[PDB]
Amino acid sequence: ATADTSPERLAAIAKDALGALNDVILKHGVTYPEYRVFKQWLIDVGEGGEWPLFLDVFIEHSVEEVLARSRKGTMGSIEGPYYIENSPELPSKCTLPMREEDEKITPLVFSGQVTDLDGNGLAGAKVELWHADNDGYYSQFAPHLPEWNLRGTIIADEEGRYEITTIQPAPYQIPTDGPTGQFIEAQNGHPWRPAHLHLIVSAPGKESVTTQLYFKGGEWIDSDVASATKPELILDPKTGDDGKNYVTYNFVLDPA
Amino acid sequence: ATADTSPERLAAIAKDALGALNDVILKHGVTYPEYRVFKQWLIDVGEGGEWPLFLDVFIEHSVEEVLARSRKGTMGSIEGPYYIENSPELPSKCTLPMREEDEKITPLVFSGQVTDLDGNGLAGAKVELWHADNDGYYSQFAPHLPEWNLRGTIIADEEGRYEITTIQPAPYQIPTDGPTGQFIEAQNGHPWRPAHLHLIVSAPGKESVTTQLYFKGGEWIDSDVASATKPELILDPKTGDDGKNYVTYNFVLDPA
Ligand SMILES: [Cl-]
Ligand SMILES: [Cl-]
Ligand SMILES: [Cl-]
Ligand SMILES: [Cl-]
Ligand SMILES: [Cl-]
Ligand SMILES: [Cl-]
Ligand SMILES: [Fe+3]
Ligand SMILES: [Fe+3]
Ligand SMILES: [Mg+2]
Ligand SMILES: [Mg+2]
């Protein structure tokens, strides 16, 4: 990981970041016992391998909010910690890899088109999709799961269209066995995200968009622990007589 | 490490701490590349075992500033990361353990009395002292050094008086081989503390004081990387015809 940040820029960021934390300590009268706890908790986060989790839950949303200023296309959201590159490519109309267990869940049929800002459909567009199963697990983050379970890179058609069947996502509880759970527990917080799809949508000569999609009336939409839900990203799927949920959502890309 | 902090209190601290960092990201337009760097750097701090160093250098001073509000006695300062409990007890007039190498350095003869707020001398008072050698090393934090080099707990006399000989401390460069050094390097900062003694001064029925003492006209006093120097804690030792530096400093304790 590299960035082009100048010494001057880092100096300024570091000054107000530290200034800000030091201001919080002064405001609340943080005590030595509390300082000692905080020190050990930071150590524990690293030893538990939880930096990606903690940062993606409590910090990334502000980083996307910065990126969001520069963008006219479909709203972005956090990547979160569970993305895997090079998920196997699938045809424009497809179902994601899943287990026999997953086949017991109500299907979600997700259709739409990738377009530019004027509404023109894009060819060569890809839709990388990943999400949790009904048990609350991500493939590659649960040793029982086939490595691409509920993961794929969908090659859109010459018009930019896709029709992707998956399972209906359910709410996701973040790992609570470690320091991040402990941080949440200690303040009577809620360790839950709403049900969500993760997507990265790309196309030749376009700025990719990393986003998420949520479900109308879903649990936790108004109290997402990661602060990553946006009203523009809430889907309202319709149930057909086959008992499957159907929704269309188009992606709009900014130029690269 | 435990603290008595309520869920309500942690909730509030966490809210403005995170709010504050998120505000800094928004102010400066922190980018995804920069976020990725920050994530890896946090990981590196833990893997390098540098949480105590980083926090004591960049954060502890605000924690002492909180404690300072409650105190009328001699000014405190940060403990920093190098304190060791149960250093061997020494008589009221003593020299700290040192090596033949240390005996090559100009002596510092440090005298005074431990008193209450009215100026009354205290019996049963102890002065725990530790500091770096002229090479920039702390005992127990450098495998070549005898474990109590430049460390001792001085038992003051029935009047609270002490006369402690040590070596004249020299400026201290913080470890720069790791992520903390890298943080400093990346912003064209200075990885230096002024020359300093560390002391913890205690007595029956008194609140102990953890403090530091610095040296008039010393390098880095105005630009201490740890932000821990205070004008009240600057010593002005006088050189005698024996070529030794002499200084008196009295400690004043608040009641427990
Ligand atoms: Cl700073
Ligand atoms: Cl591609
Ligand atoms: Cl409805
Ligand atoms: Cl919060
Ligand atoms: Cl004692
Ligand atoms: Cl002078
Ligand atoms: Fe997720
Ligand atoms: Fe020191
Ligand atoms: Mg237009
Ligand atoms: Mg008085």
Brief overview, please?
Two copies of one chain form a homodimer. The first copy, chain A, has 256 residues and is α/β, with parallel strands linked by helices. Helices cover 25% and strands 24% of the residues of chain A.
If you had to describe this structure to a student in words, what would you say it looks like?
The structure is a homodimer of 256-residue chains. With 256 residues, chain A is an alpha/beta fold. The first copy, chain A, has 2 domains: 1-71, Helicase, Ruva Protein, domain 3, CATH 6.10.10.40; 72-256, Protocatechuate 3,4-Dioxygenase, subunit A, CATH 2.60.130.10. Helix content of chain A is 25%, strand content 24%. Chain A is built from 5 helices and 16 strands. Chain A has helices spanning 7-28, 32-47, 51-58, 60-69, 179-186; strands spanning 89-90, 93-95, 107-115, 126-130, 151-155, 161-167, 172-173, 192-193, 197-202, 206-207, 209-215, 234-235, 238-239, 245-248, 251-252, 254-255. In chain A, the strands form 4 sheets. In chain A, strands 1-5-4-9-11-12 form a 6-stranded mixed sheet, with no helix packed on it. In chain A, strands 2, 3, 6, 13, 14 and 15 form a 6-stranded mixed sheet that branches. Chain A has a two-stranded antiparallel sheet with strand order 7-8. Chain A starts with 6 loop residues before the first helix and ends with a strand. In chain A, 37% of the residues are buried. At the A-B interface, helix 1, helix 2, helix 3 and helix 4 of A face helix 1, helix 2, helix 3 and helix 4 of B. The structure holds chloride ion (6 copies), fe (iii) ion (2 copies) and magnesium ion (2 copies). Residues 80, 82, 172, 196, 198 of chain A line the site of one fe (iii) ion (FE).
